[PDB]
Design a protein around this nucleic acid. Sequence first.
RNA 1: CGCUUCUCGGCCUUUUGGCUAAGAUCAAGUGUAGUAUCUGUUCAUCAGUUUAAUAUCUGA
RNA 2: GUGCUCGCUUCGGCAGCACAUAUACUAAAAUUGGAACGAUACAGAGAAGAUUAGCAUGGCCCCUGCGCAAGGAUGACACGCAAAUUCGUGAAGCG
RNA 3: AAGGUAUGUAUCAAGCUUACAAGUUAUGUAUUUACUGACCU
Lengths: 253, 111
Amino acid sequence: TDEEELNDYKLRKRKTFEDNIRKNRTVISNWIKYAQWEESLKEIQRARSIYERALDVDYRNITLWLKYAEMEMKNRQVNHARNIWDRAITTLPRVNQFWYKYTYMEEMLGNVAGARQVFERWMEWQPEEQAWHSYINFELRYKEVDRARTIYERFVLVHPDVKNWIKYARFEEKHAYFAHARKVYERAVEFFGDEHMDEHLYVAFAKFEENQKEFERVRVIYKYALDRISKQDAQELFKNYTIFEKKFGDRRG
Amino acid sequence: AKTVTKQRVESHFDLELRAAVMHDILDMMPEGIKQNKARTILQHLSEAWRCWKANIPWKVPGLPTPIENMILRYVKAKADWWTNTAHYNRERIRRGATVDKTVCKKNLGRL
RNA sequence: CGCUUCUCGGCCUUUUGGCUAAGAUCAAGUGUAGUAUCUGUUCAUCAGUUUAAUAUCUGA
RNA sequence: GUGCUCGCUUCGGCAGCACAUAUACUAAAAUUGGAACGAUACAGAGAAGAUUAGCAUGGCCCCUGCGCAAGGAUGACACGCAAAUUCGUGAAGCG
RNA sequence: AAGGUAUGUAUCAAGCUUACAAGUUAUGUAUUUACUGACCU
Ligand SMILES: [Mg+2]
Ligand SMILES: [Mg+2]
């Protein structure tokens, strides 16, 4: 009667969980514990059914989606996990975790233009900084001169952060990009803060042009100085500007 | 469906009042992860009403001012309903419109 | 190496749900002879008294 | 089948006219699933002491009732999920 | 008429249903609380 007691255990827990969901159809603890209880049976086509009718009652929670997808991804059913990630991200665009875990899943698989397509869809909704420079970090960790150039001019139109203006000045500090890196500095210098500078762009521009030679480095800190902020700088850096310009040149007597 | 006859008047006012304060706090709280520990604003509401009937002040410390003053406007609503029913069927059991015992023994307590 | 966010676990209010007029009311033991147990309470050297031995009195 | 017309020649034989398709087919069943009640034996009884009026909410639970009354033990059935606080792991990003 | 003699389970037929799909010991006391004797009209 081992079959009898086994099916008794299964039928009593199923009857318990079905009465628990039938009482409260809104708290979703019941569906996730019942569905992962059948996931503990390790061979199922019904825990899929439990989740896929558990989102009829509430599709707007992230927990059910990411738990059903990490269930389907925890097992070898990769096609189904991808096939529910795409409906998760088209149904709920603004939640970051679905995009992150679906990109991460395809990173652990091949780096196919599927993954880049997932990413550019994720770009298309105009997210925050956290996602965008994560995608440029993806393009750097596959060593893309071409594609990290491609996807990062569309960046700056939406985030004009000074922290991001100085890091569109990155082809200098990785490729040195001479003439068009100087054009990146032109793009840095003409935009917002024309007389007010946001007090930070030309610090890093002076750091690179001081890392460069005396090509045209005298101008921007001292002789393009019409654009001051009431003193041209705080007290914290102008003597540092002077000894910044002093001892890194031809040093003529 | 079933109407609200005179035996479930009082058991329907609470139902619709706590439905209204439920989907007022559901649409009033900002984007924090938990709403009310699944029920706790309602417990403060009923405690506020019990302290109203007993005239204890109910100064709960450390409560957010939008939820504490929505509890104040809902218990003033319920106290208006309660005392305006007390006036009404006290006058009815004065001139003798009703002989209901529940109403008489209840409006001695509500007065 | 450090910093912020996310997810899994080790976890420290969860009582049976809500509302009425706190929903409503209620709730008797003796006398006698003896013990046990808490709380309160306090604990300078002879001589004979006394005691199984010990511990009051008096003595300088 | 019928009735009518000699209508064509025997009352008889023939010709024409008028009339135009029923039935949950059964008296059965090899029949069929059988739930309610009653019996049998169990389980037994809302609200943090005891006796208790109730009125609700939920739906894959119904009964009585003409019910958009009301009553069926408040008709029954409704239970441990703590969350955020400490800490481990892992990820994403940055310096 | 209801409001009172509960309801909830487990086996056993007629009622009703189609007649079909079909191949730290200790004292003295104020002092409760427990306990004893088949104690007692
Ligand atoms: Mg009930
Ligand atoms: Mg009823």
